[PDB]
């Protein structure tokens, strides 16, 4: 590549894997969202929460792909594996699964940042810090907040799950 | 002081102690507010309530400091002791601690008013009446109202604490 | 903490100490500001300068406290020690004391950044860089500029101090 | 008087004397203001300062006269003695004379408040507190501030007096 400069093949490959992770997360949130739109689940506020997150993760993947091209790397796409569950249980179960998912994305971000630091790639480090690391920390705090409120509420579970959907989401 | 007139050294000293009390209360409310912002507490309406009060108490201290200078007294600052607790328990526990705190501020206000009356300092008495005594009485009534509603609600405690935060605060 | 990830206990503790430092600085600027509001000092522009800084330092402490909660650390508050002086002398003396104070805050920021780098905590490093390090450098440059102008002016000290307050502050 | 209630003859008489004091102060400020409008003094900002105060004192006297009628007392007017000086010297001399004058008004206000308290006349006490006592304290603080700045400036007296008039008044 005529433009490629200070961009290691290790970072290029790790960026492609992170793209796959973000598209996988988007797919998981798509499944979470439509599960809560089932007539026998019917928690529209929970559906909207996860569908919003599906779009966020997809836009994350696109920003990584744009940056890959800006640095002169080459995007490589792999199969997207299906979400880990077909049915997601209660709002509590779903929010726990979502926190687990975001923490695995955050760890991938941190690992890629460590690689960029080891390769002395400051543009990559700045890119992750500006557009991903703070967003992950804020999102995980929000999900933690939600988890705590769901748990406080489902100590009469049906009533609690309805009130959280109506008054928080 | 060229401007000092009818302003006793006893009142000057008591004003400085009241400034310390108001800054201490501000600090306590700062700790109360961020406790309820913890991910394992997560009651944003309670956090906002106490953070608003932290600002009110700080503005109280500043008004006392401005008046101290207007009368020709000299502000003297002392160490600010840390809040009495590191963790504040439930919304009920926190609102009880807050009422206790405001009643101690109110008693300090009343004692300073009694001193000004004993020293025949009508400007001081009017200053306390216009800017502090009514505000304390209104605030304590509001906290009493909140206490009663929290108590009525936590007769299913988790559900009650969530509903109060969502629908009152 | 359910949300805590890549956040060492050493950083958590250093963040709490930085919160104490910023609240102490806020308290110092409160004392500086009201000193210049004394009827026998009467430099309103200097009072406004330091009172503005008291608010900035308080907002700094609050941003650190918010970030502490976002990462899953636990805020711990300690006694706030009183400012180092009761009377601050001339505008020159006060601006020297203020520069000394800001450089000690800056050094604490730099030490915390070094700790985060040693712990491979890029979210912390980015947080300090975005919200604190540039603000400190700009503020210290401004105080240096002010110091130089005060010094040029007080080579007829009373006249110089009045003109600086009227025409710069 | 059909309407007179809880209004002692001692308070009625003291209100009439305070009216004379306020009209005398108004007259003094009229003389101060036009002295600084002399072509051989020519400090227009000082002239405007004292002429503003002449109007304030006149409005004070009118408010006392209105209150006298509201309580059913009878206004009695006496000769107004001329100001104590024909020429007022420098801005420094004039501001010292003005502070002396305001402190004598303040002491008269405080004495009348003490009389009302001794006569258990709360309407009188409230009237003085709302409309006079705070205004006097603020005005005396401002004059103290001005005095300090004039003194700092006239440590090159002609230049100092010009700069104060131009940049403060």
Swiss-Prot record, chains A, B, C, D:
Quaternary organization: Oligomer of 24 subunits. There are two types of subunits: L (light) chain and H (heavy) chain. The major chain can be light or heavy, depending on the species and tissue type. The functional molecule forms a roughly spherical shell with a diameter of 12 nm and contains a central cavity into which the insoluble mineral iron core is deposited. Interacts with NCOA4.
TM annotation in the entry: none
Keywords, ordered alphabetically: Acetylation, Cytoplasm, Cytoplasmic vesicle, Iron, Iron storage, Lysosome, Metal-binding
GO MF annotations in UniProt: ferric iron binding; ferrous iron binding; iron ion binding
Gene Ontology terms: cellular component: autolysosome; autophagosome; cytoplasm; cytoplasmic vesicle; ferritin complex
Cellular localization per UniProt: Cytoplasmic vesicle, Autophagosome; Cytoplasm; Autolysosome
Domain named Ferritin-like diiron: residues: 5-154
Region Catalytic site for iron oxidation, annotated ranges: 52-59
Keyword check for NAD: no
PANTHER family in the cross-refs: FERRITIN, FERRITIN LIGHT CHAIN
GO biological process, one term: iron ion transport
Any Pfam family hit: Ferritin
Binding site for Fe cation: 52, 55-56, 59, 62
Additional detail: In horse spleen the light chain is the major chain.
Biological role: Stores iron in a soluble, non-toxic, readily available form. Important for iron homeostasis. Iron is taken up in the ferrous form and deposited as ferric hydroxides after oxidation. Also plays a role in delivery of iron to cells. Mediates iron uptake in capsule cells of the developing kidney. Delivery to lysosomes by the cargo receptor NCOA4 for autophagic degradation and release or iron.
Originating species: Equus caballus (Horse)
Protein name: Ferritin light chain
Family: Belongs to the ferritin family.
Signal peptide: none
InterPro entries according to UniProt: Ferritin (IPR001519), Ferritin-like (IPR012347), Ferritin-like_diiron (IPR009040), Ferritin-like_SF (IPR009078), Ferritin_CS (IPR014034), Ferritin_DPS_dom (IPR008331)
UniProt keyword annotation of Translocase present: no
